[PDB]
């Protein structure tokens, strides 16, 4: 479900399946080219599925996997950490905490219909993480935006900093 991690990623269940140097992960269920110490059979509650980066051993450096490079047993994956400071690109995956618009109006909460009735119902689009009243880009807008608490302005883009100047 969530393709980001919090903390050391013990509960990460995303679908990253490469390491941080781009090597495809080995399947946890496979014993070539590496024989795993952590496998679905031995550690069934750690979500060790396909070849997805996981943290079944509470490694302080986060999620990892056995690699398909015979000469490298395992390596850490490069996974996006949850929330923000900033947005990549146009904010398609922006899950940060800014909740006011360009003009400074406080956003209306996604799960509210006041002062603006709308169709962006969280339960309709759970994958879009329309959480509280945070700016989001569920629908390929220029940038994350929200509905506003100003009855006279239905919606407005937000001012989300770019991770790249």
């Amino acid at each position: 479900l969530s393709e980001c991690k919090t903390g050391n990623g013990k509960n990460y269940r995303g679908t990253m399946s490469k390491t941080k140097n781009g090597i495809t992960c080995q399947k946890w269920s496979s014993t070539s080219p590496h024989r795993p110490r952590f496998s679905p059979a031995t550690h069934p509650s750690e979500g060790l599925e396909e070849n997805y980066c996981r943290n079944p051993d509470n490694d302080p450096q986060g999620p990892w996997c056995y690699t398909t490079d015979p000469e490298k047993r395992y390596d850490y994956c490069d996974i996006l950490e949850c929330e923000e400071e900033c947005m990549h690109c146009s904010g398609e995956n922006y899950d940060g905490k800014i909740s006011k618009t360009m003009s400074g109006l406080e956003c209306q909460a996604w799960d509210s219909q006041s002062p603006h009735a709308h169709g962006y119902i969280p339960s309709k689009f759970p994958n879009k993480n329309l959480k509280k009243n945070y700016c989001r880009n569920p629908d390929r807008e220029l940038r994350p935006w929200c509905f506003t608490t100003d009855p006279n302005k239905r919606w407005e883009l937000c001012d989300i900093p770019r991770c790249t100047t």
């Binding site: 994958n127 569920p138 629908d139 807008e141």
Partner: peptide, 24 residues
Amino acid sequence: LTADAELQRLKNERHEEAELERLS
């Protein structure tokens, strides 16, 4: 009737309405 088709109509409606409220 996919999710993404709905989101696209939703954006289109949001844009259209802003233009109409602009088009004093």
